[PDB]
Design a protein around this ligand. Structure first.
Ligand SMILES: Nc1nc2c(ncn2[C@@H]2O[C@H](CO)[C@@H](O)[C@H]2OP(=O)(O)O)c(=O)[nH]1
Ligand SMILES: [Ca+2]
Length: 104
C-alpha cells in the first residue's frame, strides 16, 4: 500500500524521506537545481492546514524513485520547513492549472 498516493503515483515514507533529505541539503547550502530553481519557497496559496510551521519549501519527488537532478519535475512535490520537518506531499495531478491538491 502507498503511504502517499499522488494521482497514480505511489510513494512510501522512505521515498519521501529520501527526496526531502536531498531538497533540504540544497536549501541549507543555498543552491538550486532545474529551470524552476528547486527547492524554492512554497507560498501555500492553497491554504493547506499543515501541522508544522512555515516557511515552507517545495522539492520534486519522482515516481522513478530517483532524486530530482534537473529536467521535468513531474507533478509531485514534498513540502518541508526550515527545521527539515515534513509538512506534506502535494501534487498538480487532479488540480486545475498550476494548483495543488494533497496526496492521499
Ligand atoms: N499552486 C501554487 N503554486 C505555487 C505556490 N508557491 C509556489 N508556487 C509555484 O508557482 C508556479 C505558478 O503559480 C507553480 O507552478 C508553482 O511551481 P511548481 O510547479 O514549481 O510547484 C503555492 O503556494 N501554490
Ligand atoms: Ca518507491
Amino acid at each position: 500500500a502507498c503511504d502517499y498516493t499522488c494521482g497514480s503515483n505511489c510513494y512510501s515514507s522512505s521515498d519521501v524521506s529520501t527526496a526531502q533529505a536531498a531538497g533540504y541539503k540544497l536549501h541549507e547550502d543555498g543552491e538550486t537545481v532545474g529551470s524552476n530553481s528547486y527547492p524554492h519557497k512554497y507560498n501555500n496559496y492553497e491554504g493547506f492546514d499543515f501541522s508544522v510551521s512555515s516557511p515552507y519549501y517545495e522539492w520534486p519527488i519522482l515516481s522513478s524513485g530517483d532524486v530530482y537532478s534537473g529536467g521535468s519535475p513531474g507533478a509531485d512535490r514534498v513540502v518541508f520547513n526550515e527545521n527539515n520537518q515534513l509538512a506534506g506531499v502535494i501534487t498538480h495531478t487532479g488540480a486545475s492549472g498550476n494548483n495543488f491538491v494533497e496526496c492521499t
